[PDB]
C-alpha cells in the first residue's frame, strides 16, 4: 500500500522496516532446502 499517514507513523512506518528485516532472512531459510545441493559440492571439493 505504502504509507498513508493521517498523522500516524508510530506503528505504520516503524514496523514496516521491522517486517522488511523479518522477511529477507526467511526467504534464504526457505530456499536453504534447495541450497543443499551446492553445499554437497562445496564439502566434496574441500575434502579432496
Amino acid at each position: 500500500k505504502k504509507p498513508e499517514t493521517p498523522e500516524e507513523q508510530q506503528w505504520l512506518v516503524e514496523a514496516q522496516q521491522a517486517k522488511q528485516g523479518q522477511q529477507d532472512p526467511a526467504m534464504v531459510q526457505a530456499q536453504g532446502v534447495l541450497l543443499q545441493g551446492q553445499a554437497e559440492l562445496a564439502k566434496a571439493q574441500n575434502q579432496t
Binding site: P3, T5, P6, E7, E8, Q9, Q10, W11, V13
Partner: protein, 96 residues
C-alpha cells in the same frame, strides 16, 4: 432524498437538545516531539507540505469536558447524507 434533507439538520438539532457532541481537529493537543520524515516536504511520509506526522491518532469525533460540559462546533463535515439498512441501535449494526 427528502430523508437525507432531514439528515442535514440532525447534528445541529442533536447538539443542543440531546446535548454533547463535538467534532474537533485530527491533530491533538499534546506536542511532545514531531517524528522523522525524509527531508521536510515530501509525499512519501506526509501528504506533501500538507499536514505533519506526530504520534498515533486519527480521531476527530470526540467530545471535550473543559471546565464545564457541552461544547459544540458550529459546522461539521465528516460524513455526508446517505441512507441505508435500518439500525436503531449500535449493537444491532454490530451483528449485521
Amino acid at each position: 432524498l427528502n430523508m437525507r434533507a432531514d439528515l442535514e439538520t440532525y447534528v445541529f438539532q442533536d447538539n443542543l437538545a440531546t446535548a454533547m457532541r463535538r467534532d474537533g481537529e485530527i491533530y491533538q493537543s499534546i506536542v511532545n516531539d514531531i517524528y522523522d520524515v525524509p527531508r521536510n516536504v515530501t509525499i512519501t511520509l506526509e501528504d506533501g507540505s500538507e499536514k505533519d506526522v506526530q504520534l498515533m491518532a486519527e480521531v476527530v469525533d470526540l467530545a471535550t469536558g473543559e471546565k464545564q460540559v457541552l461544547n459544540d462546533i458550529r459546522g461539521r463535515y465528516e460524513c455526508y447524507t446517505d441512507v441505508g439498512p435500518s439500525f436503531q441501535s449500535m449493537k444491532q449494526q454490530n451483528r449485521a
